[model samples]
Target: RKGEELFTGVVPILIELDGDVNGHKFFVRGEGEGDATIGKLSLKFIATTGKLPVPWPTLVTTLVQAFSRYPDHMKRHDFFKSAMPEGYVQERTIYFKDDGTYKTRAEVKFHGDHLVNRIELKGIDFKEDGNILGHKLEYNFNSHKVYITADKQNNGIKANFTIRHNVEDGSVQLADHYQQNTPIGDGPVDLPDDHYLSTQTILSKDLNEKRDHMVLLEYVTAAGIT
Candidate 1:
């Protein structure tokens, strides 16, 4: 029982992201532990522009108790998409082929227990000649609250919306629109001071507003707004 082929111990760890998208280019290296035939791998960054939402040290510790694995899905949204720099980098671990397949000897790709998937989206320039101008957001997955601000540069307008995605009582806390720094279309078009309305409800009905809530919501909930 003393001698065996399988060995478990800390291994070389190096992570790097190459791209200038919002200063997201960086590198990291350290030592981490693993089990027999399996090792620690993966990193999840919320917005891709800054640091990871969850602390890596805490995540690694809690991974042992986490039994249910979060299924990986194709998350396509502006917040997630705009976070990624417009480039690709591969190392000794995982390499992409011309046919879009993965080649890696690290094997950590297949054996890692806790996998954090960050969105690699492109950054949007509000200076561009588009109806939807500036976009900034913060999403609390556990609390189910999301706050996002959208700017309509071409129309000289800006809008802010905060909503909760609760199952029984989901509603919007803020739905305001501004024109040239003026709150002309604040709240709903018909109700200026009213709030706590369904995000989709207010957006669907406020199609005539100058801020374009319909299209804004498309970006809001594009990737299920999760």
Candidate 2:
């Protein structure tokens, strides 16, 4: 008795948006594959900015623009396009520097339809390579917004980020950071893992906007995570 396999085909995912933005909201009226298909989403960009307003939004966009050469690719939401390789494989893993070089590395891959994103800061922390943030996402490849759940870490800082791209809004991103090291006792005690923070994206069918919800984090000083 042969069992059964449901829809196992690679769901087609194409994202393209164009519209006007006013204040904190943007409208959706654009084009592309998934942008006009069934189950389409009309998403909005929230928290266009956050605390610790470093040049993160600009940095991320520039770094992820590896595949902007294609005129078609450059015109669409660069985040979800083939700007990066795509496959159910362990793909692109490279080192990246923030305000400080050797700060971290971003690893992106595809498992079915979702992209598995993992970021690490140990390399900078010990001046040696290691892991920090291991993130997994359940994303809709066709939309502009992707949401994920994550946990905060011990002796670390937090930075919330939101990046958006639309016809009118062009690009809007932010990161809110908070250092969560408060000398537990006298020095520092190993806090339970549950004490850490936990991590998503959304899209709309009525608006044309490519939005990003991110938690921007970096390594703590040897004065700490030491």
Candidate 3:
């Protein structure tokens, strides 16, 4: 084997946000994903402002696994314990221009295993113009070219993702974009499929409440009139 590195790795980091206190920002570099060909890339935190719910550590681990689309991350979660009151989670799926096409159904686009692009958390909100939060995250990455762009608007919280066609392509996103918290009284809104729900049940068909999710699953546990 030649044993040569294909990627150069993540470069140049920046974060700027303007807003009131009670908010924070975080940036990191790590294996947002795996496979090196298309397996996993990195999803670093550009910045987040607001009061994040759920637990910190749980959020980080879950988010890392979700961004990377790795089973390992999902493994940590109790599938049954993970739920989305909203049936389908919202996510920004970016694609490159392929000879005027969306890039799908192309040979050149069939990248190996690693990823070239990544996505970051702009803000944790059930709805737009809702509650916002902050966090401290840990990330790592390898030789890969990824691009990113964000509002860079006011800086309350900005996230830009650098995406490249080569060295990174043909990947699947597994983690749910948002989480739901309901008491075990309301009916299930959009519960995970049977197969998907095998992991851990977080949402209660009667009441949706993921104690961990309620805190963003942080480094430590928090439960008090939040």
Candidate 4:
């Protein structure tokens, strides 16, 4: 539980997308797991890039890339494979900035059979630490704090995360933090527990089920900071 301290540093923020739901103009909140620092970056980025004129088809792709240093995502839509789960999609870029000291790198996501969905990463510019990290895209209607890394926090320095979400999306949503998408908010798991506490990865079959869904979140990684 010593490393558990890193978990505490993470703060959850909501992005209430100004839109409509159930026939009424409603807001859709984008959930994330990251540090409070990232939370601020999230807001700034959104305010600056709120629906920009771009070439990408979906926002999830590039949004996920901005944070690639720690967890950069697919900035280009051509990268996303066709096969997918009902709600499984790139939700957060969770990227970080790496100065010249660090090497240049890149990765790509693929949709292989058996839900092998692989996100291959590499440092194309230099030779140093070659770590290929893969995180199961998680989503929950309930509120979820940004863990940012999707991995365990080590420093536990109170916290270090960036986040972004909409405020106009007026709606109360709940679900476990686990990667799975099961209706669980109405049960024992309720407020004070948060989103991560009840969410999980999609089932094996769900991984194969593709849909036109996206996860709009803002977050920061440990690597890029001032």
Candidate 5:
């Protein structure tokens, strides 16, 4: 006796969330279809009576506007500078590779009345391809480095960064990155890999706070196949 040939059809995945919160009934459904190499996925927030901060469309618009107003350099540099206290001198260095890519390192030292109180170092490595908010996009950080030294500083603070993706048309999306809860360290930090939309903090400190260092890196690519 011979075995029959195998036939595979479209595989489907469905998920639903239904619950009553406060005085409103909320329901959400997610659907997906795929087979081995390719797939499509979508999510719908069906019904809710609770007040949302803002509609999805409006929220997306505001986010786009905010990012547009700030160039990458401003976000990478000025944002950090603004958070520091007064009387700090900043020094920046850019190392360009032959391939046109570049790495940036910045050091900020606090000199109050000619006294050195604090010193911080930051290194950023970023790369991107394709248009963001378009059908295809990719971006990532090869590594982000931070080092701090302060006089008589005993308390430590936690930091985190997150990114989210929302497609105008409901479609399947994929993302490869570290989980939001992953701890920051002195080595590479994994970020989102592809597409999709995606915070927490941990604190540890030393007595002198002489040397505190951390580094993170992540990559992502998003596109539609023909």
Candidate 6:
């Protein structure tokens, strides 16, 4: 019987770090091992690090430079198919604070309408005097349930209800709902003074009616991150 089993091991990663400084271009070869897990046809890389042939500040600087290039590299490398395995769907959610300032963004993956069991959450905070702070976390969704509602008109207004994990009693309860209030018109609709907009988008390996509903459900529970 070949049932799904969890396997863990250390895997080596060969990374190329490149940059141009003052008209000089350079590339560094870095190596590191990541704690990896494979189960249910999904792979996760945890606590990954890179070894660079440079001193403290230079190493940190180059690491930050490499980190900042992820967005572009993801687009360039087809989201790193050679490394991170592809999922059936990739969904992104952007939440705006009640005051209309940028709050946070979350990215998640799904497999055939099932939550991938983890979330990548990134949030930022700004101060009145112009200071700013950013936060990032990866959360497990093992104990949460998500429900979604979408308007038939496809006007972009959707709601999601999230049943959250309660640690106190090892139970679950209805947490809260977040809605996208985009009106049913072609033009931009003004939101109420006290209302801010959160948006959802989905990219699927196979586009179909079923995938659409799964994307919506993913959109719903992800709001709980707020």
Candidate with the greatest lDDT versus the true structure: 6
Candidate 3, which segments miss by more than 4 Å at Cα?
1-22, 32-58, 61-112, 122-194, 197-226
**What TM-score, to 2 decimals, does candidate 2 have?**
0.22
Candidate 3 has a TM-score of 0.22
Q: Compared with the true structure, what per-residue lDDT tens digits does model 4 show for residues 96-135?
A: 2220011111121212211111121111221122110111
Residue 160's lDDT within candidate 2 is: 30
Which ten residues in a row are the worst by lDDT in model 6?
60-69
lDDT of candidate 6?
0.24
- lDDT per residue as tens, model 5, 16-87: 333222222333332333221111221222223343212222111111000011122223221222223221
Q: What is the lDDT of residue 162 in candidate 1?
A: 25
In TM-score terms, candidate 4 sits at 0.19
lDDT of 2 at 86: 37
Off by over 4 Å in 4: 1-8, 20-26, 36-212, 216-226
Q: Cα deviation of 171 in candidate 5 (Å)?
A: 24
Q: List the candidates ranked by TM-score, beginning with the highest.
A: 6, 2, 3, 5, 1, 4
**How does each model score on TM-score?**
0.19, 0.22, 0.22, 0.19, 0.20, 0.23
lDDT of 6 at 204: 24
lDDT of 3: 0.22
Candidate 6 wrongly placed segments (more than 4 Å): 1-41, 47-142, 152-157, 166-226
* lDDT by residue (tens digit), candidate 2, 1-226: 0000111222223221221111212221111211211122222222333321122232232121111121222222222222123311111211322211223333433335432333332222211221111111112211122121111343322223233322123322222222121211223222221211111123223244234332221111110011
Q: Number of clashing pairs, model 2?
A: 29
Pairs clashing within candidate 1: 81-121, 81-122, 82-122, 84-121
- Candidate RMSDs in Å, in order, are 22.1, 19.2, 20.8, 21.0, 24.0, 18.3
